[PDB]
Amino acid sequence: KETAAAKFERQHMDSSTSAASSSNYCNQMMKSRNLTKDRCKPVNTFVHESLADVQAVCSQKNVACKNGQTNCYQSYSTMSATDCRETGSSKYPNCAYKTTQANKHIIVACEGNPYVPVHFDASV
Ligand SMILES: [Cl-]
Ligand SMILES: [Cl-]
C-alpha cells in the first residue's frame, strides 16, 4: 500500500516545470502519474514548486479544512499550480482534461512525523 505522504507527492507534485507548458499538460500528467488507470480521476491539482516549499506549508498558516478538521495549512505565498479537470468529451479509457494554470495560495492537510502534506484541500 502507498503511504499518505507518497500518494500526495505522486498526485500533486510537479517540480520539474515552472507551469503547465500547454493545453495537453493535464492529459499527459494525469496518465503518467497513474490517475487514469481504472477510472478517470475527475479533478486534480499539480503544484509547480519544490517538494521542500510545499512541505514547509505544514508550518505556515493554520486554517480550517472544509471538513472542519484543524490540520490544514494555507501557504503564505502564492504558488504556481495547474488545475486538471475532465472535459465533457472524457469518458474512459480515453480520459480528456482541460488544463488551467495559475498562481494561488495552496491549502493542505498535514499529518505524521515528519509533519507533511497528505491531502490537497484547495487553492485560494
Ligand atoms: Cl514511491
Ligand atoms: Cl486536487
Curated annotation (Swiss-Prot):
GO molecular function, a single term: lyase activity
Function: Endonuclease that catalyzes the cleavage of RNA on the 3' side of pyrimidine nucleotides. Acts on single-stranded and double-stranded RNA.
Disulfide-linked positions: 26-84, 40-95, 58-110, 65-72
Glycosylation site residues: 1, 7, 34, 37, 41
Protein name as annotated: Ribonuclease pancreatic
GO CC entries: extracellular region
Taxonomic source organism: Bos taurus (Bovine)
Keyword DNA repair: no
Residues shown, of full length: 27 to 150 of 150
GO biological process, one term: defense response to Gram-positive bacterium
Family: Belongs to the pancreatic ribonuclease family.
Enzyme's top EC category: lyase
Residues where substrate binds: 7, 10, 41-45, 66, 85
Domain of life: Eukaryota
Lineage of source species: Eukaryota, Metazoa, Chordata, Craniata, Vertebrata
